[PDB]
Ligand binder design. Structure first.
Ligand SMILES: NC(=O)[C@@H]1CC=CN([C@@H]2O[C@H](COP(=O)(O)OP(=O)(O)OC[C@H]3O[C@@H](n4cnc5c(N)ncnc54)[C@H](O)[C@@H]3O)[C@@H](O)[C@H]2O)C1
Ligand SMILES: NC(=O)[C@@H]1CC=CN([C@@H]2O[C@H](COP(=O)(O)OP(=O)(O)OC[C@H]3O[C@@H](n4cnc5c(N)ncnc54)[C@H](O)[C@@H]3O)[C@@H](O)[C@H]2O)C1
Ligand SMILES: [K+]
Ligand SMILES: [K+]
Ligand SMILES: [K+]
Ligand SMILES: [K+]
Lengths: 489, 489, 489, 489
């Protein structure tokens, strides 16, 4: 009701969907309906694929430096419109304005800026075999690719997916999460306004079980880049494989361990622990939700965490002084409380929070308190399963190697981190920790240069860094024969 | 009956399976039963996984140069045992001794030799962010991986899969094709005898719908490398994804185009065409089974092909003078004849062959004649579908761009090739042809340095070359923070 | 003088030289003094180094993307000021405005734009040795470097040297040729205006015998990048070497061969030959001044060359219709006339030109007519020596291997090119030619991505491409021991 | 003489010099003449170049894997002959058999083994410009190169220079130090015995003033790789430069700092310091001859050094129990004694040694006792100059930035190292140290994978690692024009 009805974006403009259906997006801070949003039909998918196939030909036909200049213009527009977009993202996600205006668009554009600079650097190889033959490889665009977004960092994800895709000369059809479809459409406008050819970046809104599914099954789409839950991830990846043997990137969930070594500065450890659990109200996939503390440090560490949790400024996300907002959706809140209850039921020691915040106004949003459990065990549900809400589990150990083994003891493998002042501990531990994203004495920083993604069931492929650009191309090997050809027949 | 009963190979030795079942492998040249072969049970898979998990730890703990030296020793043994292995491969596949002793083991060991030299070259990156922080990446072994083989080049495939896997410090459990399980077991012996730790290369025999399936579903196996039909490929890839989100390499089938440009030397074109269709009795996946000839050259080209087909020495594969043997299996022969019949039924012009060779002795094997159809059309079944037997389809064109468009007009994309003496034609055509493996004025050569694999539904990932070694590792990003950490809380 | 006296540029501004000496730059089109120019003293060099050492620390302390953004801003300014700069360069060099407006600044800025995007891509390696030790490398700035320019492409050369230097975090002190000091001072203003810190790009004017010598001798300068004559190159490289063991880049002269094969399009061949000899009035280092024609093509090719030479618009370089200006200076003209005279004396056949152009206004300038000699012999002075003027030598050959051996029979090795339609001959010929810069069926194009430089006495090191960026850093290996250290004592 | 007269090695065999001049090599342990050695004449150099030019063509014409196999065979032979070679090297250099048996040949062969595996990995780039033009690069051999060796690690240095040279398809003419010519001649026999073509590795004996000079001046040699003193390095590099513009590699001397931070394990620190000063009797270029100790640690650290020095087994290098031999020659000894005398004169505090060892057999040798000076000052001769003998200078510091600035305050920059347990200090310190070879908590280890070389006046270029292999090729860019060529004329 707050906004005009949102339409699909195809061929450098808004078009009417052909399903007759809509859905609504809700501000989770107050329950207000933000907008009616159209549902893409199976035929709308077809339209967007045809648009993308054509746009990609125009885009790939431009020179590298031409793509580079256009993507830079988009970066520039993103910089200037940083605050408008953050405000929109705060409305849609409930995340504090303090975060969206300094992180979401900022780090999204950083990656686009990075890749824009790298377009002329994409190169194949040359390999001499003998005087009369040699080989060269070509890195060619995949063609049409599809991105599927999650709801925790809507625009950032769109950017981190579309940037390398477009830089490598592909077209992307992007499906934002049903929960957070607003910023994705703005991004499509900005691309068009920067000079990105019609059809190169199209946005389809709708549900994953339909639109997402249809993108995953389409025989003309070459690759799917997905970000979401491990369970969904497996279904998306399977449908992508069985339909037409597509390429896949999977950025999934985790239960990332944070190991505080017994020599650690507990102030730093505590700051890290709280950042690794309560930023974006605990809705970051790389969150360090299993915190290992050595028995000699438990009491002091718990106190230091407690002092920090107590000063967390939960509040209205539109207030600049807020640094902890509501969760993204009332149903997701219900799921987090469900997990919190299991922690209580399973005799984990509640250190703080554990409840919904219902006091005046807060009752109108989906606010869960920053919750900390301690004296947890490896068989607890809060320790084994991804919660995706502000729930830290503090776990005690006595042997550093035991801590590592337990850290590794999971089907997840997204992130890991250690806090220590010791050279040998830092590097030796990090080397044995089975995860794709590893932090020493810090947490959460994810530079454009740094390739990120999960080990095991936390992912397939990577985002950011040089490697990701390469994986939005396909290798063609060309053997040139300059001498004679011999047949056995 | 010819050989002892074949057992599983686990932990550097032969072990009894626990299914109680066996199957038989047949020499397709004479129908003789070569050997009873044990069927791996679900519990045998578990045993091989546990063996592999342990072996991989020993192997990965050795230095790079230590792995290098051992893999070189294996190469050396492969060189010395080249003729024994070829003879065995000829018995199992029906492929001429002329091919197995100069190609199969030779090119298999070449790739192992290549990768052996490259072990100390595997490196991560280093990226400075600022005076107080930097990033380094590590390329770490995947751990336990599984190879699944096809029956056309049994030992070569095992080698091309296991070489980069082992070089990157992984363990591989290999499942050869039911049709051709013999050489894979020999390879396992040779690895052990070269100094490869127990469990690093294990072989399970059995059927794909069982053992293959169980490997694909296992939660402790990190990656599946598969080589086989596109249809099977899609099922394997989906099961690999849905079970535990494994990494995948898919080397699948194709309907690769060969375009003869109107300036081409027709002698060379004909030699290429016949090599690209009748080597290994037409059972090569990269076969150029759709041959485009310009209307001005059709008559002369057909004659030149005919002169070459007529001198093909079909015969007993154990005779050195044979250069065209039977197909791999009587059922596969029945399938090829089925396709041949459809070509006749659909009014394609039979140029030669088209029948089973039943004359004295040949009636005891599964021999199909080298078959050539001409005046074919893009909607014919022999033109649209992979036959995997000695069946060439000659197709006529008038516009070079039309030829390219038609070459591209398929869901396949494994290989492509052009014959021309013109600089501009060669490179411009090859650039527009949608395939991973592209030949100019030659066919079938696949050097260790050259990464090979399909576009579209012909594959995911690559084999051979530097890139393949890298993809048997996983990237870990490590960010080292050397300065202060700032918390918003 | 047309312009005010030109001062040194040190620390983000113009400053007075302390030599009390000047020289003048003259317009070679009319003999007018463009400007008095100050000569740097030793003290001024010392000042420039101090300024550079301080600038470099500030520049290096910024982040990659900060440097990137600043260089991009410089690109924008160069794009805007393209015409002003072109006009100034035309005054200083005598090159036609039609060239300077479309080549010099455009391609200079192109290279800067390329490197600006690459700054965040500069990466070290990481190598695992064993569980308790690993290595990582850093690519660190060299520090302070010096670029010494040539007079034929003054601003372009300043840009191709300073771009990777600055992109890699260095400061550069640049000394333009005393013949063309004007545009380098403009570039320095532009860098400063773009946000490049004071001291990072300083310009010293003066002679090679003084200022240039002092730069190569200075113990605080880490690298000299030099473009100019081979003889001078040797002296510069020896002084850089023996003084303090500096790294060096040398882009020197050539006598590059152009081989026209009997299957060449002769219209393309003649276009290529003329472009390869008469662009910038033949003052391009990579010029194909030895043109090999097959005997069967001689008459026809000479006629085609003559048709093109006759329609060359020799004239006032400020007239937009001019495409052939005077030479850069009167003494250079005289040197070229001497060579021309030598050609007549040694009985080459003059096909056209061979004389100074003196009619009307031309006598006030340094105009040499486009000159073609034919029936040349390998022992002729005009065939052995770099003339650096508009003088083509046509050499007849009978077979292809003979042409190649003759092409290679020189101490030079800057560029080479072949003209042919045959696929095999193009690549095979090019692989045998001993030159760093090779063109097939074209000439002169030098994309930012393509490493360019000389073989043999034509060069050391490269410019442009990824490699050049790397060669403006130095490698530091860091070995981290995480385990025990064993002493033998 | 112990051995027969040593001849030149040219073209796969020994040949007579044409100088009619000889010199002798002497065992520095007893003063005995080991052998007469022929001096190469200019004609002999000319012969060696001709032989090399022809060998290189044969070598380069083989395939990568053929070269690889041949170098591997050389590795095997070196492994077998390790003890014979060690014993010979001990005779020529005076280094303890315990070092030569376990370091010199082992690590020399290690590097050869590394590069042998890398030959097939040498690759060019391919860059697409537009649909009608692309670029590929070739990495071509340099051709004939020369290596000039030093006397402290004769065979190792011959191996580290020749390995990448030969791996990249070059021929190398090697001139060992006149002080230690014996093992280089052995290596040449071994290469030939392994299947290296005649002329590919030739050895010339003689002096630097003659033979070495003639090699740097020769117009057909493409590159000089030099290891030795900085002063000589400058002369060599200037002669290589000014003669014919050769590429150069310089591995020069140093005054490398070892910084012991207040949080260091002092037992490790003392072990590191002693190893960094007294291994090979202190005749290692990367030696940490400036040892920085914090004031609070001074007394304790000196005592720990003294305990280790006192148990050094100075003795007959042929005794396996010896771990500290004499210096390489009597004049080198005298130079070291002069430096020691200078240290006493300038009032450094002698902690131990400081004298020639003359008792019994020792007087027949060039034995200098392990010497430690302490309370040194930055302006002392022993602190500023490379002594290249067993002389440690201990320098006290008060804060960490002071130590680093003082470490950096030198024209040298070969190696640096820090000892500390702190994570942040280790990396931060190392990043500020101006040296090409940096060790954290260790010293002296130089893996084949790790690029080693000097900053500043300690070096130009690198040895070992991937980069060094690349720097033994030259880059040729090839631009293929597939479309029209436009001329302005
Ligand atoms: N790696 C990281 O950093 C990550 C960062 C982001 C959060 N991360 C993950 O995101 C999850 C939140 O999402 P969820 O509440 O579980 O819904 P879903 O995971 O299904 O929603 C994701 C998207 O999938 C589309 N979708 C749904 N079903 C589909 C189907 N069958 N076929 C095709 N598509 C389908 C759907 O429309 C939506 O757009 C968390 O669990 C985190 O693990 C980690
Ligand atoms: N790219 C190239 O070059 C290639 C080179 C080789 C031939 N190439 C391909 O090989 C095919 C021949 O094989 P096919 O007659 O169709 O049997 P299948 O393709 O099923 O046999 C392949 C393997 O899959 C295992 N398997 C079967 N079902 C399974 C299941 N459900 N889960 C898990 N595994 C399963 C099975 O046990 C066998 O080992 C040809 O069509 C070529 O395209 C191209
Ligand atoms: K995975
Ligand atoms: K695919
Ligand atoms: K050179
Ligand atoms: K230097």
């Amino acid at each position: 009701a707050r906004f005009e009805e949102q339409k699909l974006y195809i061929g450098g403009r808004y078009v009417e969907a052909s399903s007759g259906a809509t859905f609504e997006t809700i501000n989770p801070a107050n329950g207000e309906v933000l907008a009616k949003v159209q549902r893409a039909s199976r035929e709308d998918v077809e339209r967007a694929v045809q648009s993308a196939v054509e746009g990609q030909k125009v885009w790939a036909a431009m020179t590298a430096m031409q793509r580079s200049r256009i993507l830079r213009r988009a970066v520039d527009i993103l910089r200037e419109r940083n605050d408008e977009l953050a405000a929109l993202e705060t409305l849609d996600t409930g995340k504090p304005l303090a975060e969206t205006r300094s992180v979401d668009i900022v780090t999204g554009a950083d990656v686009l800026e990075y890749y824009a600079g790298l377009v002329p650097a994409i190169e194949g190889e040359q390999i001499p075999l003998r005087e009369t033959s040699f080989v060269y490889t070509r890195r060619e665009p995949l063609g049409v690719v599809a991105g599927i977004g999650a709801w925790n960092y809507p625009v950032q994800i769109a950017l981190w997916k579309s940037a390398p895709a477009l830089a490598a000369g592909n077209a992307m059809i992007f499906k934002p999460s049903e929960v957070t479809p607003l910023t994705a459409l703005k991004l499509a406008e900005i691309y068009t306004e920067a000079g990105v050819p019609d059809g190169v970046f199209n946005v389809l809104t709708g549900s994953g079980r339909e639109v997402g599914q249809w993108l995953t099954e389409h025989p003309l789409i070459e690759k799917i880049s997905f970000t979401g839950g491990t369970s969904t991830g497996k279904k998306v990846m399977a449908s992508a494989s069985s339909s037409s043997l597509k390429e896949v990137t999977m950025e999934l969930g985790g239960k990332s361990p944070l190991i505080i070594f017994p020599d650690a500065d507990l102030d730093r450890a505590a700051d890290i622990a709280v950042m690794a659990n309560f930023f974006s109200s605990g809705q970051v996939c790389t969150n360090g939700t299993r915190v290992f503390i050595h028995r000699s440090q438990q009491a002091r560490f718990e106190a230091k965490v407690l002092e920090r949790v107590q000063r967390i400024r939960l509040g209205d996300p539109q207030d600049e002084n807020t640094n902890f907002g509501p969760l993204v959706s009332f149903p997701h809140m219900e799921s987090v409380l469900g997990y919190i209850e299991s922690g209580k039921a399973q005799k984990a020691r509640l250190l703080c929070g554990g409840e919904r915040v219902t006091d005046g106004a807060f009752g109108k949003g989906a606010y869960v308190a920053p919750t900390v459990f301690t004296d947890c065990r490896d068989d607890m549900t809060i320790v084994r399963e991804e919660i995706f809400g502000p729930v830290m589990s503090i776990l005690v150990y006595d042997d550093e190697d035991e801590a590592i083994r337990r850290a590794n003891d999971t089907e997840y493998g997204l992130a890991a981190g250690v806090v220590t002042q010791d050279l040998a501990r830092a590097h030796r531990a990090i080397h044995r920790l089975e995860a794709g994203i590893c932090w020493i004495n810090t947490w959460g920083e994810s530079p454009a240069e740094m390739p990120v993604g999960g080990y095991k069931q936390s992912g397939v492929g990577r985002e950011n860094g040089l490697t990701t650009l390469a994986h939005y191309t396909r290798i063609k090997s060309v053997q040139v024969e300059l001498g004679d050809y011999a047949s056995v027949f």
